[PDB]
Amino acid sequence: PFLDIQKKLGISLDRHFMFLSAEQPYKNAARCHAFEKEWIECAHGIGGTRAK
Amino acid sequence: PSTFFNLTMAFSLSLLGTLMFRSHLMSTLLCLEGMVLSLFIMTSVTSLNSNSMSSMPIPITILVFAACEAAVGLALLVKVSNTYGTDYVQNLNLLQ
Amino acid sequence: ARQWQPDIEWAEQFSGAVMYPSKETAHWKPPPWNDVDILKEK
Amino acid sequence: IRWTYARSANIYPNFRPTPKNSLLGAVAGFGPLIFWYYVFKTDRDRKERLIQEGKLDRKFNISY
Amino acid sequence: MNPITLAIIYFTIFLGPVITMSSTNLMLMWVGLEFSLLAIIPMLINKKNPRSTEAATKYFVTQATASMIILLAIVLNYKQLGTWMFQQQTNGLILNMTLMALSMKLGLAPFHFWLPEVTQGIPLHMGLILLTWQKIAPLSILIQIYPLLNSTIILMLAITSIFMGAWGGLNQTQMRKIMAYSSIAHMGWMLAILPYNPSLTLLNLMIYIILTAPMFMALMLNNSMTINSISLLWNKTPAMLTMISLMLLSLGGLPPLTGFLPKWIIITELMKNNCLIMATLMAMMALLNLFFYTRLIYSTSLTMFPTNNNSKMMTHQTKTKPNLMFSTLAIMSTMTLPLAPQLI
Amino acid sequence: YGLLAAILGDKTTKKLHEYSRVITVDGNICSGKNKLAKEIAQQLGMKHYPEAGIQYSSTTTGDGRPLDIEFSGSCSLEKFYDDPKSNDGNSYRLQSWLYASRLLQYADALEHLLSTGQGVVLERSIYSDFVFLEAMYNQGYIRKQCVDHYNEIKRLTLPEYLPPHAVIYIDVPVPEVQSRIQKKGDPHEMKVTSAYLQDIENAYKKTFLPKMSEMCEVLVYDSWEAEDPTKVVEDIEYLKYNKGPWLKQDDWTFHYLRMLVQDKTEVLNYTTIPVYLPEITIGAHQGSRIYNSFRELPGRKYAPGYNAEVGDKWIWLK
Amino acid sequence: MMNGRPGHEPLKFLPDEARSLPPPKLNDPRLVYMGLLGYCTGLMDNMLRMRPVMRAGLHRQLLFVTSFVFAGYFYLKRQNYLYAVKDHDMFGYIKLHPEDFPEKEKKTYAEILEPFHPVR
Amino acid sequence: MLKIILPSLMLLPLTWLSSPKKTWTNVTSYSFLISLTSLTLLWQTDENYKNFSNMFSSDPLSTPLIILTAWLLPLMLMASQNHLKKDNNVLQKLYISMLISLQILLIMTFSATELIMFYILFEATLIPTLIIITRWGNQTERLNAGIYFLFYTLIGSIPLLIALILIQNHVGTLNLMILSFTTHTLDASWSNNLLWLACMMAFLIKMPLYGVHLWLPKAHVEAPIAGSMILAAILLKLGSYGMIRISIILDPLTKYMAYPFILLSLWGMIMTSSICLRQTDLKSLIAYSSVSHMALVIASIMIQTPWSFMGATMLMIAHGLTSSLLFCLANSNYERIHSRTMIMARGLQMVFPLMATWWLMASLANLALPPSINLMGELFITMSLFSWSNFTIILMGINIIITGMYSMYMIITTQRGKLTNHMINLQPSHTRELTLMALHMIPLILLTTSPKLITGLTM
Amino acid sequence: DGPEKNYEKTLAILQIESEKAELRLKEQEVRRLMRARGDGPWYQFPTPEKEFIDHSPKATPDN
Amino acid sequence: LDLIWLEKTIPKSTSTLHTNMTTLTTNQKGLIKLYFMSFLINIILIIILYSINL
Ligand SMILES: Nc1ncnc2c1ncn2[C@@H]1O[C@H](COP(=O)(O)OP(=O)(O)O)[C@@H](O)[C@H]1O
């Protein structure tokens, strides 16, 4: 974000849980898990202006 | 669904409240809280029907921060009816 | 003679809680220097 | 000293915009300023037309 | 303050903006905002004077409702996109809420009423923190979300702030409130270029911080909250009269000094983006800000106001010095203009 | 002295002892309080501060040689007496400078008390200055606003400083003082209208004494008890320092008070408030000249330690 | 803007790629300015603290003139890189998307009829 | 051109470092030589403009001024050694430095290739000037005068800032060289009709036009002599220099967008000239003389005929020198008299024989006596104006008759008539006062011998 | 030194200024294109990172 | 035309115009209720500004 002290430090205290398809407790997938993946592996390397 | 529009309007009705004081600081500090309940209920509701368990931490973090927030708010309130003998807002007009 | 340095009266205007005093605004009075109002016995 | 102050620093503190003062305060600033415009425009336009049509001699005029 | 408490509070007032900036999960950005709200309130009432309790109770209510509105935006997004963070798809109303809310915490435009009043009842010191280390947090949140916010609203809040700040300042004679009003104005320029070139917002802020921090440590060196009070600067400490003069004209946009660059490049960027309507009106009333800056100049430097005999007594005693920061932040601010290209 | 020092020891709490108190002795223009003071001081080793003077601040700062009158605010107690209700108002300017001088003295006293731990006898104090102004307004000496300006300065600065622990007091009826004046002859001091002396004591009796009675220990002494420092000293050692605001001064509270008195420029910050009553006003042209001239005195043109005139050295590395 | 670029170093000051660029000459007018900017800070400090302006803190004067300058070389070293990235980025695009930036060919004046507005 | 500038900067170190007693001579002696280095720019054996380097250039229009800007700093520092000799030794070294920075900044502004370099330096000159006028101004009203001088220039300035950034986007560089050799032809839209006004208005304001000239009478009245010399000799001409270099672009619109100003100026020339006829303050009369003789210039930088331009260049340099001379002698009367009133102090020639000769020559320069560059200048603007419309001679003909009347009235009621009975006795003339004058007129005599150097870009 | 030096110096000054001018304008066109096209390194706004998508086998089947 | 008409129109008028603005804009009760509702009005207008330009 504004100051990426997280990527730099390598820590991931705030990224592991930002979307539904992220690791769910006890490996219990959340609903919609079939699409968000398909909609973020698509928009990866393509910026937003062209993720839209 | 509609359930969400009721909660959202509850937050707006609570919004209209905090933004229109009626001579009672306590009442406001009480309206303010009405929002936090509406936010807590809405966050919990969607997290629950999205089966998004990774996010349930938030519904509570919201309450924990909101409680202290209110603690600070009430200490200011007690401070005011110690300096002016009332919580009435009109008294708070020295900074003009 | 000597460059006119401001007299007391020139200074006076800058006192008062508002520079350009209004109709009702002028009725106000400058804030206490100590930042603590005399207030009341309460 | 009472004379100079009365004549250059006691004027605007004693100005009240009336008629006979603003009518006369506009005829003086814009009156001739509009008069000469139709004096200079008409001449400059007469000149230009004549130059365009080919009549103005502009002889031995190698300067401007 | 039990020095331990001082540490906990100060840490929070400092962990508050830093969490906001570092995190991406908006939620964590909200609590960063929440911690700043909780940490600042204790310091605000340190004198505990009757004016102070009023200040904090206003600051807190204004800050709290805005905090709740920012949370509502995050809660709504969570339903419109499972993500906990604004995305291209975000409903426009969702973002506009965040603008209004964040423009209340920062105190821009039609929500500019709380700042002048809280700046009036808090000490000069806590005044600085309330003006400059509490603007970093919300602005971070906006700068991160710039691609998505509305160009129209920002501009309206921008222009309004410039006007309100300027007009408000003209009448004020209390210094704390003159600064509060200036901050509203500068904050306006900053939010004007956010939609177009966020990187310039971060310049129009730093320069504001490098200008305001010296200006306030100047006001408190003699702890003068009145212009009449700062006007007798010539007797209390004569040297700061020179730089106080340039820093205030620098705060306004006059060309040789560092203060022109933020306005100049913001105008260059807005014209590059074609807002030659908006930019023009902003620059024009920006000129109103210098009028009240120079009126203070008059009282403090160009003209010597009469002083009190008891002042001779304060001269005798050695004047506690101004920290080094004053100098390093006065010069880097009054004259860096020859080095603008690198700054931008 | 700062939080750093305080954090690591340097606590006023560890430096206080029974003999450590702020004791002021107040009386009429000639109560022999000067004598009682020195003795009480000699008794408990208390640093005896002399009554505040026009040049007390100059003796306080830098060289300590007495300053020229105009440098010290152009105040004459001498002129106070020979020309009461003067056109220029030297009497009010004298009183305002006197209040600033005791503000410096009281603050210097508190700094010695919290640092050394030794107590302090300050004779008259900011707390006992109002009686002169009350009598002056009761007389034609000062006008009503003049009074308001002093009261405003008093309300702004005096509350911050802690109250006198006890306020030893002497009393000697107006006839006594006038007679006492005759013994030390001075044309000026001599011509003090009795009624004015009447008004000074009246204030202590009525206003100052009971005022402080509730706040601090009050020991009133008849002239006879006086001139017997031993007995008075005995009584001080006898009173119990309980009632008063001093009870709540925890170490973490003293630190801030110390850092105030440690900064003279603040102690009298509100003494220079920009209230423009005519007597107080320097005036820019006169004030600028007096400044260029006070600031050019040797050792004053630069901060202590940096002016070479008086023999300071090492300036190029300081 | 330039953030989001491929390879961006998330928190680094000046990526090693900036090694390729020439180092700023220590006497670059700018670094020399920073020096003077610094000396003045020093002198100003002495003044505000009421010390002999030039003859005091000759150690500090050095810290200042030498702190500012130190800062410069390492800042300019970066700002120089940032600008250099800007070209690498800009020029590249002009090519990768050539059609959008087409090399036009102007006509010589002999062909261009430019209007003449007679002053007269 | 960094010898006309770097050595100048170094003056500042010398005013500060030097002894309090010797500060005046080091500064004045050195800038006299600084003027001598300035004379090297005059060596232009060829037509090509001398582009010293990327940012710094000097063409025929700037060169005649850079030398005047360098020349007056010596004189300004010699005219203000009296007042400002009652100061504390650190107020002086500030005034001397302020004067030094004005020509450093003004030398660069007149010698600047990039138009926005002109703007930044252009509007910076206000800082030094406002300090000189407000800080040392004798009258109670200088705070007001300073405000007028800052706002009229500033409100004009921000439109120019927007306009120049605008052309940079439209053309792609604000470099005066390129802008000249590139096709920038405005298209007579309604908007362009605004651009033109944006660029010219800021220059038209500091070059007092009839509509916005109230700032100059108020400013010179309370300004100290050095500030009044700078405002009349170099500061006002900054506006003219700007109009010459900025109208290279906006080429088509001024053909028809100038009428408003031209008429404002020529009618303005008559009224400003006339009110000089009955104004009691001498400094007031010289200031309105300055407005009228500068109203002629905005009416030649707008007709835009070769002769106008160099008529303008001739008059600007000439009137600059003459006005100062008048403002400098006005001060000498003011310091002994202690009042600006023209009616007092009558008969001075009887008591100050020479200053009166300087007064006479200054007045003859003020009115157009013929073997003077002042007349050549007006004769040329007059010619072109006549070409624009033969009727112009009527208005430029009422001004000549009025200009003769007020110029001689200043001599007749100040330097002739019976002596004032007993004002504070008027001490004799110092040699500084007389030289400060001689230094103004000896160059006026020398330039009139070879007018070619100050003829402008056009010829 | 001569007429040669200024003529050749002025041409060098013009080439630097002409080339700087062409580039400044091209920047404005490139920057217009990448903002809208988003097909160039500048103006590449972020979207979530696939480095967190959990591709593990979930106990809950069918997803 | 000099002095009054050319000083009342350009230099003085602009002096008067803005002072009125500050006076009207800066004459505030200082009471929170008033100020806050103004926040209410703002939210309403901005809600609309988005709505109508949807
Ligand atoms: N407020 C005041 N106004 C005028 N004089 C004062 C004031 N306070 C103290 N003094 C002076 O202090 C002196 C005290 O008398 P002195 O005999 O010197 O000491 P003591 O009071 O101990 O006997 C008086 O002569 C009186 O003039």
Domain B1-96 of CATH type 1.10.3720.10: no
What are the domain boundaries of chain B?
A: 1-96
* Residue G104 covered by a domain: no
Decide whether any atom of ligand 1 lies within 6 Å of the F176 Cβ: no
Residue I51 burial (10 A CB sphere; 0-12, 13-18, 19+): exposed
* Phi and psi torsions of F170, nearest 5°: -110, 160
Per DSSP, the three-state class of H341 is strand
* Phi and psi torsions of E78, nearest 5°: -50, -20
Give the separation between CA E290 and CA H123, rounded to whole angstroms: 14
Could F302 and G52 be called an inter-chain contact, meaning their C-beta atoms sit closer than 8 Å? Answer: yes
Decide whether any atom of ligand 1 lies within 6 Å of the F216 Cβ: no
Give me ligand 1 centre to Cα F187, in Å: 14
Within an 8 Å CB–CB cutoff, is residue E171 touching chain J? yes
Decide whether any atom of ligand 1 lies within 6 Å of the F132 Cβ: yes
Give me ligand 1 centre to Cα F82, in Å: 14
Could F270 and C6 be called an inter-chain contact, meaning their C-beta atoms sit closer than 8 Å? Answer: no
Resolution (A): 6.3
Which residue is listed with tokens 């024989």?
H353
Which of the residues H131, H140, H143, H225 would you substitute to probe the C interface, choosing the one with the greatest number of C C-beta atoms within 10 Å? H140
Could E117 and J30 be called an inter-chain contact, meaning their C-beta atoms sit closer than 8 Å? Answer: yes
Q: And the tokens for F12?
A: 């006023």
E-chain residues within 8 Å CB-CB of H159? 280
- Across the interface, of B85, B94, B96, the residue whose CB is closest to C42 is B85
Within an 8 Å CB–CB cutoff, is residue E168 touching chain J? yes
Q: And the tokens for B87?
A: 């919580």
* Phi and psi torsions of F120, nearest 5°: -145, 130
- Across the interface, of H45, H48, H178, the residue whose CB is closest to I21 is H178
Q: If you ran DSSP here, which 8-state letter would residue F20 be given?
A: -
How many helices and strands in chain C, by DSSP H and E?
A: 1, 0
User: How many residues does this entry show for chain F?
Assistant: 318
Q: How far is CA B27 from CA B19, B22, F113, H68, J33, in A?
A: 12, 8, 50, 75, 14
Sheet holding F22-23, edge to edge: F22-23, F120-121, F47-48
Within an 8 Å CB–CB cutoff, is residue E70 touching chain B? no
Domain count, chain J: 1
Cα H78 from chain centre = 18
- Across the interface, of G50, G57, G59, the residue whose CB is closest to F302 is G50
Start-end of H helices in A1-52? 5-9, 36-40
Per DSSP, the three-state class of I49 is coil
- Which atom of ligand 1 has the smallest separation from the CA of F27? 21
Q: And the tokens for F143?
A: 């006008």
Q: If you ran DSSP here, which 8-state letter would residue F221 be given?
A: E
Q: Number of C-alpha atoms within 13 angstroms, CB side, residue F302?
A: 19
What are the domain boundaries of chain E?
A: 2-344
Within an 8 Å CB–CB cutoff, is residue G120 touching chain D? yes
Decide whether any atom of ligand 1 lies within 6 Å of the F35 Cβ: no
CA-nearest residue for atom 19, ligand 1, is F30
B-chain residues within 8 Å CB-CB of A31? 49-52
Q: And the tokens for H159?
A: 């439109």
- Across the interface, of B19, B90, B94, the residue whose CB is closest to J36 is B19
Instruction: Determine contact, residues H246/H203, Cβ cutoff 8 Å.
Output: yes
Minimal-distance CA residue of chain A relative to E20: A2
- Which atom of ligand 1 has the smallest separation from the CA of F181? 17
| Shortest Cα distance, chain A CAs vs residue B68, angstroms | 23
E-chain residues within 8 Å CB-CB of C8? 306
Which of the residues J23, J24, J25 would you substitute to probe the C interface, choosing the one with the greatest number of C C-beta atoms within 10 Å? J23
E-chain residues within 8 Å CB-CB of H143? 298, 302-303
Give me ligand 1 centre to Cα F201, in Å: 13
Residues sharing a CB contact under 8 Å with residue H235, sequence separation 6 or more, in sequence order: H106, H125, H129, H206
- Pairing type for strands F120-121 and F47-48 reads parallel
Instruction: Determine contact, residues H232/H272, Cβ cutoff 8 Å.
Output: no
Degrees, nearest 5: CA angle J23-J29-J35: 100
* Residue G76 covered by a domain: yes
| Shortest Cα distance, chain A CAs vs residue G103, angstroms | 28
Q: List residues bridging with F23 in a β-sheet.
A: F121, F166
Give the separation between CA G73 and CA G31, rounded to whole angstroms: 7
Name the experiment that determined this structure.
cryo-EM
Which residue is listed with tokens 């520079």?
C19
* Phi and psi torsions of H58, nearest 5°: -140, 115
- Across the interface, of H148, H152, H275, the residue whose CB is closest to J2 is H275
Q: What's at B59, amino acid-wise?
A: P
Assign 3-class secondary structure to chain E. Answer: CCHHHHHHHHHHHHHHHHHHHHCCCHHHHHHHHHHHHHHHHHHHCCCCCHHHHHHHHHHHHHHHHHHHHHHHHHHHHHHHCCCCCCCCCCCHHHHHHHHHHHHHHCCCHHHCCHHHHHHHHCCHHHHHHHHHCCCHHHHHHHHHHHHHCCHHHHHHHHHHHHHHHHHHHHHCCEHHHHHHHHHHHHHHHHHHCCCCCHHHHHHHHHHHHHHHHHHHHHHHHCCCCEHHHHHCHHHHCCHHHHHHHHHHHHHCCCCCCCCHHHHHHHHHHHHHCCCCCHHHHHHHHHHHHHHHHHHHHHHHHHCCCCCEHHHHHHHHCCCCCCCHHHHHHHHHHHCCHHHHHHHC
Instruction: Determine contact, residues F261/F114, Cβ cutoff 8 Å.
Output: yes
Give the separation between CA E185 and CA E286, rounded to whole angstroms: 8
Smallest Cα–Cα separation from E116: which of B80, B91, C23, J32? J32
| Shortest Cα distance, chain B CAs vs residue E6, angstroms | 17
Instruction: Determine contact, residues E292/E169, Cβ cutoff 8 Å.
Output: yes
Q: What's at D44, amino acid-wise?
A: R
Within an 8 Å CB–CB cutoff, is residue E55 touching chain B? yes
Write out the residue range of the structural domain in which residue G60 sits. 1-97
Q: If you ran DSSP here, which 8-state letter would residue F166 be given?
A: B
Could G11 and A4 be called an inter-chain contact, meaning their C-beta atoms sit closer than 8 Å? Answer: yes
Q: What is the largest CA-CA distance in chain F?
A: 62
* Phi and psi torsions of G113, nearest 5°: -95, 110
Within an 8 Å CB–CB cutoff, is residue H12 touching chain E? no
Instruction: Determine contact, residues E208/E289, Cβ cutoff 8 Å.
Output: no
Give me ligand 1 centre to Cα E189, in Å: 62
Give me ligand 1 centre to Cα F189, in Å: 8
B-chain residues within 8 Å CB-CB of C37? 94
Interface of J with H in 15-54 (CB under 8 A): none
Minimal-distance CA residue of chain D relative to J4: D12
Q: What's at A3, amino acid-wise?
A: L
Interface of A with I in 1-52 (CB under 8 A): 15-16, 18-19, 21-24, 26-29, 33-34, 36-37, 40-41, 43-44, 46-51
| Shortest Cα distance, chain J CAs vs residue B90, angstroms | 7
Give the separation between CA H312 and CA H236, rounded to whole angstroms: 13
Q: If you ran DSSP here, which 8-state letter would residue H419 be given?
A: P
Q: And the tokens for E313?
A: 């007594």
Which DSSP string do the residues of H15-56 spell out, in sequence order?
HHHS-TTTHHHHHHHHHHHHHHHHGGGG---SSS-B--SSS-
**Neighbors of chain I with 3 or more C-beta pairs under 8 Å:** A, E, G, H
Start-end of H helices in H111-141? 115-124, 126-136
Ligand 1 pocket test target in F25, F49, F77, F177 with most atoms within 8 Å of CB: F77
Element housing F120 (H / E): strand F120-121
Instruction: Determine contact, residues G64/G38, Cβ cutoff 8 Å.
Output: yes
Element housing F47 (H / E): strand F47-48
Q: And the tokens for B76?
A: 């200011």
CA-nearest residue for atom 9, ligand 1, is F29
Could B84 and C28 be called an inter-chain contact, meaning their C-beta atoms sit closer than 8 Å? Answer: no
Decide whether any atom of ligand 1 lies within 6 Å of the F29 Cβ: yes
Q: How far is CA E171 from CA E168, E282, J24, in A?
A: 6, 20, 10
Q: How far is CA D34 from CA F215, G85, H256, H299, in A?
A: 84, 60, 16, 17
Instruction: Determine contact, residues I13/H51, Cβ cutoff 8 Å.
Output: yes
Give the separation between CA G66 and CA E211, rounded to whole angstroms: 23
Give me ligand 1 centre to Cα F77, in Å: 8
User: How many residues does this entry show for chain D?
Assistant: 64
Q: And the tokens for E70?
A: 């920012």
Could H158 and E302 be called an inter-chain contact, meaning their C-beta atoms sit closer than 8 Å? Answer: no
Cα H445 from chain centre = 19
Could A5 and G4 be called an inter-chain contact, meaning their C-beta atoms sit closer than 8 Å? Answer: no
Instruction: Determine contact, residues E135/E141, Cβ cutoff 8 Å.
Output: no
J-chain residues within 8 Å CB-CB of H275? 2
G-chain residues within 8 Å CB-CB of F316? 55-58
Contacts 24+ apart (CB under 8 A), H375-378: H376/H311, H376/H314, H376/H451, H377/H311, H377/H312, H377/H314, H377/H315, H377/H318, H377/H319, H378/H296, H378/H311, H378/H315
